[PDB]
Amino acid sequence: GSLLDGPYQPTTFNPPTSYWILLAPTVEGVVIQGTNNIDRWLATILIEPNVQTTNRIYNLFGQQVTLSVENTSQTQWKFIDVSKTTPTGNYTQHGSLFSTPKLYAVMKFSGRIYTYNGTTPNATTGYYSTTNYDTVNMTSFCDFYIIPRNQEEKCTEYINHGL
Ligand SMILES: CO[C@]1(C(=O)O)C[C@H](O)[C@@H](NC(C)=O)[C@H]([C@H](O)[C@H](O)CO)O1
Ligand SMILES: CO[C@]1(C(=O)O)C[C@H](O)[C@@H](NC(C)=O)[C@H]([C@H](O)[C@H](O)CO)O1
Ligand code: NA
Numbered sequence: 001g002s003l004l005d006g007p008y009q010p011t012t013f014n015p016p017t018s019y020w021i022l023l024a025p026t027v028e029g030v031v032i033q034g035t036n037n038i039d040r041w042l043a044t045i046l047i048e049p050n051v052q053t054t055n056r057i058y059n060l061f062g063q064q065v066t067l068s069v070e071n072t073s074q075t076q077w078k079f080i081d082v083s084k085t086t087p088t089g090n091y092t093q094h095g096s097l098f099s100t101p102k103l104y105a106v107m108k109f110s111g112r113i114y115t116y117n118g119t120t121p122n123a124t125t126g127y128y129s130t131t132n133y134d135t136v137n138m139t140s141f142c143d144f145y146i147i148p149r150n151q152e153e154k155c156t157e158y159i160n161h162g163l
Contacts, residue, residue: 008145010142013138014136015138018108018149020106020147020148021107022104022155022158023044023143026142028046030059031043031045032139034113034136035137036130039086040083040113040136041091043060043061044104045079045080047069047070047080050071050073050074053070054068055068058082060082076119076120077098079096079104079115080094081094083128095117097123098119099120101161105155105159108133108134108136110133111133112128112133113128113130113136116156120160121161122160
């Protein structure tokens with residue numbers, strides 16, 4: 001199709017700005033990570049339905065990181081964005097997406113990293129103001145597609161309803 005470039009394999013890349021990276025993860029874990037190497041170490045984790053509060057180990061930027069996570073949703077998977085602002089600091093959790101299709105998306109745009117949050121089929125976009133936003137290198141750990149920002153409405157549709 002002429003709307004969705006891909007699919008592409010898991011890879012390390014520095015995407016251009018104004019492009020949504022539509023991610024299609026399979027199992028629970030780290031979906032994607034990215035950093036400006038300065039003041040933003042950002043990642044998205046996926047959690048299966050019905051997970052009571054527990055510590056889990058995630059491989060973030062080549063080290064084991066223990067995070068306290070939960071998914072109280074009985075039916076929906078949970079994407080959590082994870083952020084630390086210093087290389088030696090702690091990750092905090094933001095912009096949860098409760099999802100049935102299990103699709104996620106990320107974009108570098110005007111000073112920010114954009115992702116989706118809320119509850120499908122009514123998910124919206126959210127953002128993280130990021131120093132040198134355009135330089136952020138990403139590693140996707142799952143298959144992904146590329147869709148232009150001018151076609152954002154269709155990306156939102158996919159987040160909410162699936163492919
Ligand atoms: C500072 O707030 C947060 C965070 O890290 O962003 C919010 C998050 O909802 C919470 N997670 C749970 C399951 O309660 C978490 C842990 O309580 C804390 O990190 C202990 O490690 O604290
Ligand atoms: C400082 O304000 C903002 C920002 O980055 O511009 C506003 C933004 O709406 C908010 N996004 C979400 C999804 O929570 C974000 C994060 O809480 C923070 O960046 C985590 O470090 O904070
Ligand atoms: Na999010």
